[PDB]
Every structure is written in structure tokens, then in C-alpha cells.
Amino acid sequence: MTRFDVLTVGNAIVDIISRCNDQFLIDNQITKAAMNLIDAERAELLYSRMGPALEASGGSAGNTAAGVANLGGKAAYFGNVAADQLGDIFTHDIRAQGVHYQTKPKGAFPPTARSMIFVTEDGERSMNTYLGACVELGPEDVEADVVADAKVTYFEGYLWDPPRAKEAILDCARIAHQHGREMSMTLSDSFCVDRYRGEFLDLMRSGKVDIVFANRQEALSLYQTDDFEEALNRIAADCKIAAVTMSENGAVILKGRERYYVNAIRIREVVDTTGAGDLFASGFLYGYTQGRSLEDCGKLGCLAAGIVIQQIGPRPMTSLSEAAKQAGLI
Amino acid sequence: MTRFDVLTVGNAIVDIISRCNDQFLIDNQITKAAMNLIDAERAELLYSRMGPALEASGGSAGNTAAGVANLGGKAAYFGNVAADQLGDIFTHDIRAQGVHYQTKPKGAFPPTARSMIFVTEDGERSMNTYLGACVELGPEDVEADVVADAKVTYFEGYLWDPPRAKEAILDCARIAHQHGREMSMTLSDSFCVDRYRGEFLDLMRSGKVDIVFANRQEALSLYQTDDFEEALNRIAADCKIAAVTMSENGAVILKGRERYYVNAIRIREVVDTTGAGDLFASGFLYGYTQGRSLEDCGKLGCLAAGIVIQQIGPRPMTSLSEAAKQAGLI
Ligand SMILES: Nc1ncnc2c1ncn2[C@@H]1O[C@H](CO)[C@@H](O)[C@H]1O
Ligand SMILES: Nc1ncnc2c1ncn2[C@@H]1O[C@H](CO)[C@@H](O)[C@H]1O
Ligand SMILES: Cc1cn([C@H]2C[C@H](O)[C@@H](CO)O2)c(=O)[nH]c1=O
Ligand SMILES: Cc1cn([C@H]2C[C@H](O)[C@@H](CO)O2)c(=O)[nH]c1=O
Ligand SMILES: Cc1cn([C@H]2C[C@H](O)[C@@H](CO)O2)c(=O)[nH]c1=O
Ligand SMILES: [K+]
Ligand SMILES: [K+]
């Protein structure tokens, strides 16, 4: 028996969510649909301009871990909060979902990371993230027994921003592979890819990462191309398995020369796209560690992602397992 | 001109919201549909048993003030938070809505009040409130110039639980009436009425409160009767104006011998009733301070209430002013 199906590792963040008009993004020089890193001063400035908000636990990998547990898989998470009220919210929410979460805060300062997420009328989300205590995640936070006893360890490209998180990830890759497990990453964001393109390619080509998640824009950014067919050909050459999401066009799963196209589910409306990619990874990795086919992995991914975009908040409030049973994916 | 249409005064609370099954309430001895006061230990305990949650600024009177501002009225609020992250959330949300809010925190202990609100499948809400910093609200928090410059000062029955808040309210009543303004209260909760029945009747009969809000169960509780018609007759005898809500049956406005019945909005699905009474008061008081007929005040209250119960969270995220325009209430 393996204690865990999926361990995820990421920036532990609490989301502060508000709807805005299109001009708000322009007026405030916020790059639409992207993750915009901000300092403490800018965080205070943007917050002062933000309307009344809602808070919900976030963090890309955090959401993925939660989604896996929701579907019924066994999940763990590494990510660093502060000993403050926001960190207590993050800690509660992830543990309440049944995710193993044992990363110890180092003190109250820097405070727990938060992301001000502005949702436009089209349902797109634009994130403004102060990393706070996420900068203290390092090799000391690697629970070696957890990595050794997890079928897949999945991590965010976003971890390349804080200074020492990469060292933790390299330790994870070593332990995971020594114990016959698989490593996975998400490219996270097209600008994050712009920042760490060479390093991400090295992770894939050195075999430190076995399974890569990307959306269309990230895959284009990885190879600095406008040719999507080139991007798919190259990503398939650079990693063992690639899962590439294409928004309303669903996704394509790649393994060597194999290609499996999956449709997006029918949706009422795009309420808020926050979490779509994360929950795609949840569905995929749940299916994968249940020994399902790559196509059914894609189907589970598209189901989980389709559900999350129909609600405010990055973690489905409804039962994904029930949804999966209802959709005949079981 | 008057600087403010409506000042509200209440327990400043951040809500922590989760959906639960019916049995959860029974297993944890939570009185359904009521405000259950809890101590710090019980707060920790219930939180440990609560699923993943969302946080949103709450507090009955806070919600009401926010509602008035959303409608286009000029609102102010008195309520005490702590110097902590929950308090910063509370402060941001209310100020961001355009409500004057200048109550100063006194320290970091007790921490900002929070209420764990469990929403059952029927849309009913059961609140479990640790008062925290609210126990510090007192006469020192009365901005006398604001009370003098507000057409109506409205407060919670809930304020009779913390020790010194009633002193602040008596100060408000004196100032309001000396400047020819009106005082209003809500009965808040039927168990709250059970606790403070005599005191609430005294507030009305002595003329300290001019306008009273009640729902059916509060009105029945106030006179310890099963006869709603008796409760209406008696409440009208006890205060100048009474606004009595009847859930899906709308509301009735009473003044002397005058009665004005108003229909409820027909509801698709009741998502979460949290805030319904609060937003009824927003609409009513907005209409009242705009010189509208009592019926129209009731219509505006029912409009705002119907809106809030169709969303998660106690403060409408949509434009109430726009909704009022569409409804010809303007
Ligand atoms: N720099 C970051 N690293 C990891 N996750 C992030 C970052 N910024 C925003 N997020 C999270 O991305 C999620 C949506 O993918 C949101 O819930 C938000 O918390
Ligand atoms: N003791 C209390 N005093 C004032 N408001 C409260 C109390 N308990 C819960 N609430 C608020 O009641 C609101 C719903 O009417 C919620 O937003 C919640 O914050
Ligand atoms: C219908 C739909 C699905 N999704 C799902 C399917 C994608 O593979 C996933 C990641 O974007 O989210 C959208 O993102 N947008 C949509 O409009
Ligand atoms: C006003 C205040 C009260 N308290 C304590 C004293 C009481 O035990 C409790 C309720 O007033 O809070 C503080 O710890 N710090 C403060 O600043
Ligand atoms: C419970 C409920 C309340 N309401 C509105 C009308 C009431 O006057 C107000 C307070 O309960 O909320 C509805 O419109 N429909 C409902 O089902
Ligand atoms: K969402
Ligand atoms: K609500």
C-alpha cells in the first residue's frame, strides 16, 4: 500500500476575490488572465482600490491537492504559511478536505501569502500575488517519508519565483525517483514560463519531471512559438507524458507518439475561471493513480475543471466523486 | 443636507461559511436557523469539525449598512474589530462599499468576532458566533457628530449580549432624538428576544426606538404568543412603525392602525438565507430616508432581501440600485 496517491507542492495562498469591470485592469496596469507578482506596498495599494471581497483558500497546488481528495484519492500537500489568521484559514481548509498537511509555520512574519483575484464579466481571472511566507519554503519542509510514499509528486512552476523552493523540489525528485514514483509539474502561467523557460526544459529533459501540465499559452511560451502543432510536437519530445488543456476546446494528452483528444464538458456559464487548470490536474492525477487510461484521465480532468469554473472560489464546493459517478466515469 | 441617511450599530463579525447535512446540526447540538453564542473553546471545537469554508464580512447591522450604500444611500457604521487580519478584512469590505467606518480597534485580544455559519440543503442558516472584540464596544465608540448627522440610527437586538454596547445605544438614542432624528432596531433573533424581551419592550414603549424590524418568529417570541394577529396588533401599539417580515409571504408594515402588506419576490431556489432580514432593513431604510411611502419601503426591502438569499454570503455582490431601477422602485 502507498500512503498517498498525490503529493502536491506549491505556494500556500489565501485568495481575496472580487468582480471588476474591464477598465479596472487597464487603470491599474494588471495583466489580464495572468499571475502578477506584487510587493507589500502594491498589495496595500491594490487592496485599497478593490471592492468588497470574499476570501477562500487558494494556491494552485493546494487546489489540486484538495480536488484529488474531493474525488476520493489520498492527497498530501507541502506549502508554507505564517502563524496568523490567514495561515489558520489555509490550514483549516486543506486539512478539512482530508489532505495531509503538516508544513510548520516559521513565525508570523512574513505573513501568509494572499492573491487579489479580479474576475471580469467574461469570467477571466487576473491574480495579484504577494508571496509573503511562501519565500521561506525550503528543503527543511520536505517530509521525506511522504514523498517516498506518494505515487505522484506534483509541483508548480510558480515555485521558481521564491528563492529556495526549487531546492525542496530537487530533493523531492530525488526521493520520488529513488522509490520508483513519478514527478509531475505544471507550467503554471505563460509569464512564469517566460521567466524560467530554460530551467523548466532542463527539469523535463533531465527526467526530473515525468508528467507535464500546460495550457495552450504556456505551451506556446515554452517554445516561443505561435505554432500550436510545433508546441505539441516539442512538448511530447521533452517529457514522458504531457497534458495540454485548450480551454473550451478541452484537452489533448500526449505520450510519445500517442495523442488522446478530450472534449470540454457542457457548462451553464463561465462564472469564474479561477482553478480550472488546477482541477484539471486533480481529475487527471486522480485517474492516473487509479490506473485509468490516459483518455479517461483527460475526461476526469475536464469534468473537474468544468465544475470549478461554474462557481466562485477555486476549490469545488460540491462532490466531485458524485459528479464523476453521475457522468459515468466512476 | 444631512451627511448620512442611515447609521447602523452592531457586532462586527467575519462569517465563516460552509454547507452541511441535517445530521451535523443534531450531532453538534446547534439550534437550527438561530444565532448560537459560543466561547473560544467551542469555536475551536466546531471549526475543527467544519468542512472547507469561505469567509465574508458579516454582522447583521454591517450587512444592513452595506446594503443601504449599495442602494445609493449614505451609510455609516459603528462596530468593534481587533487589530488582526480578520479585522482588516472587515474594515476593508465595509469601507470599500462606501460606508463611513472609523471605529478604532483596541488591541489584538480578544480577536475579531467570527461566526461559523452552516447552511443546510433547504437554504437555512445556523450561526455560531464567538463575539471576540465585540465585547469591547461601548460609549467611547459613539461618534456623536455622526449620530447627530444621520436621519436614522439603526441597531441590533444582538447588541444586548455583549456587556457595554447597550450604553453606547442609549447615548445614540439621546443624541439622535435631540437632533430630531429617528432610532430603529431589529429584534435580531427569537432567542435573543427570549433573553431580552422586557428590555426590548421598554426601548419601544419609552420612545427610545421609533422603528422596529421583526420577523414572524421574533414577533411571536416578543409577546410569547402563537397568535400572529395578536403579535401584529401588539407590536403596532408598542412602537411608532413596525416592519414585520414573513419569509416567502413577504412583509407587513404597521403604523398606528395603518397596515401595508407587500409580496415576496418569487424565488427560483433559496441558496442561502443569510442576510435576508438585514437586507430587508437596507431596502426599507433606504426607501424611508428617501421619503418613500411605507409600502414602497416594504417593496424595496423585499427586493433587496430576495436578491441576497440567491447568493452565497450576506452582502449582495450585485447592484441593488440597478435592480431597484429595473423594478420601477428607482
Ligand atoms: N504565485 C502563485 N503561486 C501559486 N499559486 C498561485 C500564485 N498566485 C496565485 N495563485 C493561485 O492560483 C489559483 C488559481 O490557479 C488561485 O487559487 C491562487 O491562489
Ligand atoms: N451575535 C451576533 N450579532 C450580530 N450579528 C451576528 C451575530 N451572529 C451572527 N451575526 C451575523 O448575522 C448575519 C446574518 O443576519 C451574518 O452575516 C452574521 O455575521
Ligand atoms: C467549457 C470550458 C471548460 N474549461 C475547462 C476545460 C479545460 O481543459 C480546463 C482548463 O482551462 O478548463 C475551460 O477552461 N473553459 C471553458 O469554457
Ligand atoms: C480591552 C482589552 C481587553 N482584554 C481582555 C480583558 C478581558 O479578559 C477580555 C474581555 O474584555 O479581554 C485584553 O486582553 N486586551 C485589551 O486590550
Ligand atoms: C425565506 C424567504 C425570504 N424572503 C425574503 C422576504 C422576507 O421579507 C425577507 C426576510 O425573510 O426575505 C423571500 O423572498 N423568499 C423566501 O423564501
Ligand atoms: K472558480
Ligand atoms: K445569502
Coordinates of N, CA, C and O in Angstrom, one line a residue, chain A residues 83-185:
Chain A
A83 N 2.2 31.9 11.0 CA 1.4 31.7 12.2 C 0.4 32.9 12.3 O 0.6 33.7 13.2
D84 N -0.5 33.0 11.4 CA -1.5 34.1 11.6 C -2.9 33.6 11.2 O -3.0 32.4 10.9
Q85 N -3.9 34.5 11.1 CA -5.3 34.1 10.9 C -5.5 33.6 9.5 O -6.2 32.6 9.3
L86 N -4.8 34.3 8.5 CA -4.9 33.7 7.1 C -4.2 32.3 7.0 O -4.8 31.5 6.3
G87 N -3.1 32.1 7.7 CA -2.5 30.8 7.7 C -3.4 29.8 8.4 O -3.4 28.6 7.9
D88 N -4.1 30.2 9.4 CA -5.0 29.3 10.1 C -6.2 28.9 9.2 O -6.7 27.7 9.2
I89 N -6.7 29.8 8.4 CA -7.7 29.6 7.4 C -7.2 28.6 6.4 O -7.8 27.5 6.2
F90 N -6.0 28.8 5.8 CA -5.4 27.9 4.8 C -5.3 26.5 5.4 O -5.7 25.5 4.9
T91 N -4.7 26.5 6.7 CA -4.5 25.2 7.3 C -5.8 24.4 7.5 O -5.9 23.2 7.2
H92 N -6.8 25.1 8.0 CA -8.1 24.5 8.2 C -8.7 23.9 7.0 O -9.1 22.7 6.9
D93 N -8.7 24.7 5.9 CA -9.5 24.4 4.7 C -8.9 23.1 4.1 O -9.6 22.2 3.6
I94 N -7.5 23.1 4.0 CA -6.9 22.0 3.3 C -7.0 20.7 4.1 O -7.3 19.6 3.6
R95 N -6.8 20.8 5.4 CA -6.9 19.6 6.3 C -8.3 19.1 6.4 O -8.6 17.9 6.5
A96 N -9.3 20.0 6.3 CA -10.7 19.7 6.4 C -11.2 18.9 5.2 O -12.2 18.1 5.3
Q97 N -10.5 19.1 4.1 CA -10.8 18.4 2.9 C -10.2 16.9 2.9 O -10.5 16.1 2.1
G98 N -9.4 16.7 3.9 CA -8.8 15.4 4.1 C -7.4 15.2 3.5 O -6.9 14.1 3.3
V99 N -6.8 16.4 3.2 CA -5.4 16.4 2.7 C -4.4 16.4 3.9 O -4.6 17.2 4.9
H100 N -3.4 15.6 3.8 CA -2.3 15.6 4.8 C -1.5 16.9 4.6 O -1.0 17.1 3.6
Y101 N -1.6 17.7 5.7 CA -0.8 18.9 5.6 C -0.2 19.3 7.0 O -0.8 19.6 8.0
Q102 N 1.2 19.2 6.9 CA 1.9 19.3 8.1 C 3.1 20.3 8.1 O 3.8 20.3 9.1
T103 N 3.2 21.0 7.1 CA 4.2 22.1 7.0 C 4.1 23.1 8.1 O 3.0 23.7 8.3
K104 N 5.1 23.3 8.8 CA 5.1 24.1 10.1 C 5.4 25.6 9.8 O 6.4 25.9 9.1
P105 N 4.6 26.5 10.3 CA 4.9 27.9 10.1 C 6.2 28.3 10.8 O 6.5 27.6 11.8
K106 N 6.9 29.3 10.4 CA 8.2 29.6 11.0 C 8.1 30.8 11.9 O 9.1 31.2 12.6
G107 N 6.9 31.4 12.0 CA 6.6 32.6 12.8 C 5.5 33.3 12.1 O 4.9 32.8 11.1
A108 N 5.2 34.6 12.5 CA 4.1 35.4 12.0 C 4.6 36.3 10.8 O 3.7 36.9 10.1
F109 N 5.9 36.5 10.6 CA 6.4 37.4 9.6 C 7.5 36.8 8.8 O 8.5 36.2 9.4
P110 N 7.5 36.9 7.5 CA 6.4 37.5 6.6 C 5.0 36.8 6.8 O 5.0 35.6 7.2
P111 N 3.9 37.5 6.6 CA 2.6 37.0 6.8 C 2.2 36.0 5.7 O 2.9 36.0 4.7
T112 N 1.1 35.3 5.9 CA 0.7 34.3 4.9 C 0.4 35.0 3.6 O -0.2 36.1 3.5
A113 N 0.8 34.3 2.5 CA 0.6 34.9 1.2 C -0.9 35.1 0.9 O -1.7 34.3 1.3
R114 N -1.1 36.1 0.1 CA -2.5 36.3 -0.4 C -2.5 36.7 -1.9 O -1.5 37.3 -2.3
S115 N -3.6 36.4 -2.6 CA -3.7 36.8 -4.0 C -5.0 37.5 -4.2 O -6.0 37.0 -3.8
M116 N -4.9 38.8 -4.7 CA -6.1 39.5 -5.0 C -6.4 39.2 -6.4 O -5.7 39.5 -7.4
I117 N -7.6 38.5 -6.5 CA -8.0 38.0 -7.8 C -9.3 38.7 -8.3 O -10.3 38.8 -7.6
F118 N -9.1 39.4 -9.5 CA -10.2 40.2 -10.1 C -10.8 39.4 -11.2 O -10.1 39.0 -12.1
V119 N -12.1 39.2 -11.1 CA -12.8 38.4 -12.1 C -13.7 39.3 -13.0 O -14.5 40.1 -12.5
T120 N -13.3 39.3 -14.3 CA -14.0 40.2 -15.2 C -15.3 39.5 -15.7 O -15.6 38.4 -15.3
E121 N -16.2 40.3 -16.4 CA -17.5 39.8 -16.8 C -17.5 38.5 -17.6 O -18.5 37.7 -17.6
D122 N -16.4 38.3 -18.4 CA -16.2 37.1 -19.2 C -15.8 35.9 -18.4 O -15.6 34.8 -18.9
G123 N -15.6 36.1 -17.1 CA -15.2 35.1 -16.2 C -13.7 34.9 -16.1 O -13.3 34.0 -15.3
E124 N -12.9 35.6 -16.8 CA -11.5 35.5 -16.7 C -11.0 36.0 -15.4 O -11.7 36.9 -14.8
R125 N -9.9 35.5 -14.9 CA -9.3 35.9 -13.6 C -7.9 36.5 -13.7 O -7.1 35.9 -14.5
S126 N -7.6 37.5 -13.0 CA -6.4 38.2 -13.1 C -5.9 38.3 -11.6 O -6.5 39.0 -10.8
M127 N -4.7 37.7 -11.4 CA -4.3 37.5 -10.0 C -3.1 38.4 -9.7 O -2.3 38.7 -10.5
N128 N -3.1 38.8 -8.4 CA -2.1 39.8 -7.9 C -1.6 39.3 -6.6 O -2.3 39.4 -5.6
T129 N -0.4 38.7 -6.6 CA 0.0 37.8 -5.5 C 1.2 38.4 -4.8 O 2.2 38.7 -5.3
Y130 N 1.0 38.5 -3.5 CA 2.1 38.8 -2.5 C 2.5 37.5 -1.9 O 1.7 36.9 -1.2
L131 N 3.7 37.1 -2.1 CA 4.2 35.7 -1.7 C 4.3 35.6 -0.2 O 4.3 34.5 0.3
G132 N 4.6 36.7 0.5 CA 4.8 36.6 2.0 C 5.6 35.4 2.4 O 6.7 35.2 2.0
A133 N 5.0 34.6 3.3 CA 5.7 33.5 3.9 C 6.1 32.3 2.9 O 6.9 31.5 3.3
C134 N 5.5 32.4 1.7 CA 5.9 31.4 0.7 C 7.4 31.5 0.4 O 8.0 30.5 -0.1
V135 N 8.1 32.6 0.7 CA 9.5 32.8 0.4 C 10.4 31.9 1.3 O 11.6 31.7 1.1
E136 N 9.8 31.4 2.4 CA 10.5 30.6 3.4 C 10.4 29.1 3.2 O 11.1 28.3 3.9
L137 N 9.6 28.6 2.2 CA 9.6 27.2 1.9 C 10.9 26.8 1.3 O 11.5 27.4 0.5
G138 N 11.5 25.7 1.9 CA 12.8 25.2 1.5 C 12.9 23.7 1.8 O 11.9 23.1 2.2
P139 N 14.1 23.2 1.6 CA 14.4 21.8 1.8 C 14.0 21.2 3.2 O 13.7 20.1 3.3
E140 N 14.1 22.1 4.2 CA 13.6 21.7 5.6 C 12.2 21.3 5.7 O 11.7 20.6 6.6
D141 N 11.4 21.7 4.7 CA 9.9 21.4 4.6 C 9.6 20.1 3.9 O 8.4 19.8 3.7
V142 N 10.6 19.4 3.4 CA 10.4 18.2 2.7 C 10.2 17.1 3.7 O 11.1 16.7 4.5
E143 N 9.0 16.5 3.8 CA 8.7 15.3 4.6 C 9.1 14.1 3.7 O 8.3 13.7 2.9
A144 N 10.3 13.6 3.9 CA 10.9 12.6 3.0 C 10.0 11.3 2.9 O 9.9 10.7 1.8
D145 N 9.4 10.9 4.1 CA 8.6 9.7 4.1 C 7.3 9.9 3.3 O 6.8 8.9 2.7
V146 N 6.8 11.1 3.3 CA 5.6 11.4 2.5 C 5.9 11.3 1.0 O 5.2 10.7 0.2
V147 N 7.0 11.9 0.5 CA 7.5 11.8 -0.9 C 7.7 10.4 -1.2 O 7.2 9.9 -2.3
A148 N 8.4 9.6 -0.4 CA 8.7 8.2 -0.6 C 7.5 7.4 -0.8 O 7.4 6.4 -1.5
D149 N 6.4 7.8 -0.1 CA 5.1 7.0 0.0 C 4.0 7.7 -0.8 O 2.8 7.6 -0.4
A150 N 4.3 8.5 -1.8 CA 3.3 9.1 -2.7 C 3.5 8.6 -4.2 O 4.6 8.7 -4.7
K151 N 2.5 8.1 -4.8 CA 2.6 7.6 -6.2 C 3.1 8.7 -7.2 O 3.9 8.5 -8.0
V152 N 2.6 10.0 -7.0 CA 3.0 11.1 -7.8 C 3.3 12.3 -6.9 O 2.5 12.6 -5.9
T153 N 4.4 13.0 -7.1 CA 4.6 14.3 -6.5 C 4.5 15.3 -7.6 O 5.3 15.2 -8.6
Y154 N 3.6 16.2 -7.5 CA 3.3 17.3 -8.4 C 3.6 18.6 -7.8 O 3.3 18.9 -6.6
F155 N 4.2 19.5 -8.6 CA 4.6 20.8 -8.2 C 4.3 21.9 -9.2 O 4.2 21.7 -10.3
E156 N 4.3 23.2 -8.7 CA 4.0 24.3 -9.5 C 5.3 24.9 -10.1 O 6.3 25.1 -9.4
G157 N 5.3 25.3 -11.4 CA 6.3 26.2 -12.0 C 6.4 27.5 -11.1 O 7.5 28.1 -11.0
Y158 N 5.3 27.8 -10.5 CA 5.2 29.0 -9.7 C 6.3 29.0 -8.6 O 6.7 30.1 -8.1
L159 N 6.7 27.8 -8.2 CA 7.7 27.7 -7.1 C 9.1 28.2 -7.5 O 10.0 28.4 -6.6
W160 N 9.3 28.5 -8.8 CA 10.6 29.1 -9.2 C 10.8 30.6 -8.8 O 11.9 31.1 -8.9
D161 N 9.7 31.2 -8.4 CA 9.8 32.6 -8.0 C 10.4 32.8 -6.6 O 11.4 33.6 -6.5
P162 N 9.9 32.1 -5.6 CA 10.5 32.2 -4.3 C 11.9 31.6 -4.3 O 12.2 30.8 -5.2
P163 N 12.8 32.0 -3.4 CA 14.2 31.7 -3.6 C 14.7 30.3 -3.4 O 15.5 29.8 -4.2
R164 N 14.1 29.6 -2.4 CA 14.7 28.3 -2.0 C 13.8 27.1 -2.3 O 14.2 25.9 -2.1
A165 N 12.5 27.4 -2.8 CA 11.6 26.3 -3.1 C 12.1 25.3 -4.1 O 11.9 24.1 -3.9
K166 N 12.8 25.7 -5.1 CA 13.4 24.8 -6.1 C 14.3 23.8 -5.5 O 14.3 22.6 -5.9
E167 N 15.1 24.1 -4.4 CA 15.9 23.1 -3.7 C 15.1 22.0 -3.1 O 15.5 20.9 -3.1
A168 N 13.9 22.4 -2.5 CA 13.0 21.4 -2.0 C 12.5 20.5 -3.1 O 12.4 19.2 -2.9
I169 N 12.2 21.0 -4.2 CA 11.7 20.3 -5.4 C 12.7 19.3 -5.9 O 12.4 18.1 -6.2
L170 N 14.0 19.7 -6.0 CA 15.1 18.8 -6.4 C 15.3 17.7 -5.4 O 15.5 16.6 -5.8
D171 N 15.1 18.0 -4.1 CA 15.1 16.9 -3.1 C 13.9 16.0 -3.3 O 14.1 14.7 -3.1
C172 N 12.8 16.5 -3.6 CA 11.6 15.7 -3.9 C 11.8 14.7 -5.1 O 11.5 13.6 -5.0
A173 N 12.3 15.3 -6.2 CA 12.6 14.5 -7.4 C 13.5 13.3 -7.1 O 13.3 12.2 -7.6
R174 N 14.5 13.6 -6.2 CA 15.5 12.5 -5.9 C 14.8 11.4 -5.1 O 15.0 10.2 -5.5
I175 N 14.1 11.8 -4.1 CA 13.4 10.8 -3.2 C 12.3 10.0 -4.0 O 12.3 8.8 -3.9
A176 N 11.5 10.8 -4.7 CA 10.4 10.2 -5.5 C 11.0 9.1 -6.4 O 10.5 7.9 -6.4
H177 N 12.0 9.5 -7.2 CA 12.6 8.5 -8.2 C 13.4 7.4 -7.6 O 13.4 6.3 -8.2
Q178 N 14.0 7.6 -6.4 CA 14.7 6.5 -5.7 C 13.7 5.5 -5.2 O 14.1 4.3 -5.1
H179 N 12.5 5.9 -5.0 CA 11.4 5.0 -4.5 C 10.4 4.6 -5.6 O 9.3 4.1 -5.3
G180 N 10.8 4.8 -6.9 CA 10.0 4.3 -8.0 C 8.7 5.1 -8.3 O 7.9 4.6 -9.0
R181 N 8.6 6.3 -7.8 CA 7.4 7.1 -8.0 C 7.6 8.1 -9.2 O 8.7 8.1 -9.8
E182 N 6.6 8.8 -9.5 CA 6.7 9.8 -10.6 C 6.6 11.2 -10.2 O 5.9 11.5 -9.2
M183 N 7.2 12.1 -11.0 CA 7.2 13.5 -10.7 C 6.4 14.2 -11.7 O 6.5 13.9 -12.9
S184 N 5.7 15.2 -11.3 CA 4.9 16.0 -12.3 C 5.0 17.5 -12.0 O 5.2 17.9 -10.8
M185 N 4.8 18.3 -13.0 CA 4.7 19.7 -12.8 C 3.7 20.4 -13.7 O 3.3 19.8 -14.7

